[PDB]
Design a protein around this ligand. Structure first.
Ligand SMILES: *[C@@H]1O[C@H](CO)[C@@H](O)[C@H](O)[C@H]1NC(C)=O
Ligand SMILES: *[C@@H]1O[C@H](CO)[C@@H](O)[C@H](O)[C@H]1NC(C)=O
Ligand SMILES: [Ca+2]
Ligand SMILES: [Cu+2]
Ligand SMILES: [Cu+2]
Ligand SMILES: [Cu+2]
Ligand SMILES: [Cu+2]
Length: 496
């Protein structure tokens, strides 16, 4: 693990996490990237060094700190052409920000095109010295991080129209169907001990149905936010979501299968794919022979309730927010592009933040045309995103904010009293009307998009220009940020 001041080298490396050798885009030569840790209230100074050289994937880069609000530091949020131009090959950029009011489980990833699929993704944990759930567990450290990743054998820019993952990597290890039987990830526990496992989806696409043979899971945290403990026997986790769950190692000393079943790709466990191993101290060095019992108590988002200040903002009636926005999704089979209310997001040449700093303060004047929505400050926003467009279920992610999910997928019931509070939500399927609320307490241009990276690349996104009149003042960027676009725009396309 590394601390909140760190020097991250982004470079290409040949790796074989599932036994197939491919060039990747990695942080300090590992997949996943190193765990970044901090304590509540810390200041981050993450110096990102771009040493990329391999022209089969993108060689510029930009890193997003997923789930961190970036109040007053919108310029450090990371989404390319929304809050910055990319860091050019050979150049560096210091992400300098603070987290005064957040503690929980997060992650970081490239936010340039589909580059994070090529390997630039890792976990980020902000610990709370006064964690209200601390009495529920004994162990919470780097050994209790569980990353779930999809992995591809072809570089991201070579993507088929509908890419499909080759393997599931748990803590960086896993197998592909028909591939070598490489060692699976092992998570070691001591009988009688209680573990805070921090489950991080760093997926580019599949959701995972996560379970551990013979063990219930007590969910205590959702996308960085403390929730009332909820015991389940399986968790369906969508791209970019995080859960902390407490596991009580109260079963016989043995090896137990950890299961992460994707919704796309190989949807079984044959030959140890989509699997890892929970090993009790004293158990043999062997693979499990446990079997899966049918989930009778799967996690339902409708049962998650925030531990602190439960309750959605605004009046507890439908459309009873200050601003009400409905997002209609479509997909063109001929062009392969997604649209939101008729507009496909294409990255603008001038990043949205720079446009605003340059005087573009209206939806009419902000690029890309039709994709940028202005919001007034200190108001309650309600967003509905009905499901149904192809490629689902789409997990939508809002930057700069956590939101309250007043209506979740698979339910027609509204909850304003204690709905789940998180930052990535599945919008479900045709017939769902997933609805979220948040308060505009954070000026800046904030991305809202499907976190399936292939769909984001195909245009499934909008930008909220929240309080554009204040944005320059509240987010005054450092000189290093001013130089990013001049450097980037001087690049010939050959060098990207
Ligand atoms: C990445 O590698 C550089 C080069 O040695 C090192 O200075 C830096 O601290 C590393 N960062 C990590 C391991 O997070
Ligand atoms: C969808 O959700 C919005 C937000 O609560 C609500 O106003 C609208 O009536 C809902 N429509 C349907 C058909 O459920
Ligand atoms: Ca360095
Ligand atoms: Cu993310
Ligand atoms: Cu994010
Ligand atoms: Cu999607
Ligand atoms: Cu994003």
């Amino acid at each position: 693990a590394i601390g909140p001041t760190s020097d991250l080298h982004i470079a290409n490396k040949n790796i074989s996490p599932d036994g197939f050798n491919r060039s990747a885009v990695l942080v300090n030569g590992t997949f996943p990237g190193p765990l970044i840790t901090a304590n509540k209230g810390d200041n981050f100074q993450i110096n990102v060094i771009n040493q990329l050289t391999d022209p089969t994937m993108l060689r510029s880069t930009s890193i997003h700190w997923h789930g961190l609000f970036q109040k007053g530091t919108n310029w450090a949020d990371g989404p390319a052409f929304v809050t910055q131009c990319p860091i050019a090959p050979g150049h560096s950029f210091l992400y300098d920000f603070s987290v005064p009011d957040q503690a929980g489980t997060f992650w970081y990833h490239s936010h340039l095109s589909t580059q994070y699929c090529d390997g630039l993704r890792g976990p980020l944990v902000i610990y709370d010295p006064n964690d209200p759930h601390k009495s529920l567990y004994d162990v919470d450290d780097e050994s209790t991080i569980i990353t779930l990743a999809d992995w591809y054998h072809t570089p991201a820019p070579s993507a088929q129209a509908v890419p499909t993952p080759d393997s599931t990597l748990i803590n960086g290890k896993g197998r592909y169907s028909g591939g070598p039987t490489v060692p699976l990830a092992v998570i070691n526990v001591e009988q009688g001990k209680r573990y805070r496992f921090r489950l991080v989806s760093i997926s580019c696409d599949p959701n995972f149905t996560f379970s551990i043979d013979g063990h219930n899971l007590t969910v205590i945290e959702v996308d960085g936010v403390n929730h009332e403990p909820l015991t389940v026997d399986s968790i369906q986790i969508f791209a970019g979501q995080r859960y902390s769950f407490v596991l009580n190692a109260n079963q016989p000393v043995d090896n137990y299968w950890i299961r992460a079943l994707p919704n796309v790709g190989s949807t079984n466990f044959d030959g140890g794919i989509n699997s890892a191993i929970l090993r009790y101290k004293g158990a043999p060095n062997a693979e499990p022979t446990t079997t899966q019992s049918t989930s009778s108590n799967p996690l339902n988002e409708a049962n998650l309730h925030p531990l602190e200040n439960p309750g959605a903002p605004g009046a507890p009636t439908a459309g009873g927010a200050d601003v009400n926005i409905n997002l209609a999704l479509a997909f063109s089979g001929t062009s392969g592009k997604f649209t939101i209310n008729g507009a496909s997001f294409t990255p603008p040449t001038v990043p949205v933040l720079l446009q605003i700093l340059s005087g573009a303060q209206t939806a009419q004047d902000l690029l890309p045309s039709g994709s940028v929505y202005t919001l007034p400050p200190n108001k309650v926003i309600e967003i509905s995103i009905p499901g149904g467009a192809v490629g689902g279920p789409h997990p939508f992610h809002l930057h700069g904010h956590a939101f309250d999910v007043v209506r979740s997928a698979g339910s027609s019931t509204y909850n304003y009293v204690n709905p789940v509070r998180r930052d990535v939500v599945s919008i479900g399927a045709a017939g769902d009307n997933v609805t979220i609320r948040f308060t505009t307490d954070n000026p800046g241009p904030w991305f809202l998009h499907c976190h399936i990276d292939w769909h984001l690349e195909a245009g499934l996104a909008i930008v909220f220009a929240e309080d554009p009149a204040d944005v320059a003042s509240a987010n005054p960027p450092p000189e290093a940020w001013d130089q990013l676009c001049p450097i980037y725009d001087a690049l010939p396309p050959e060098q990207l």
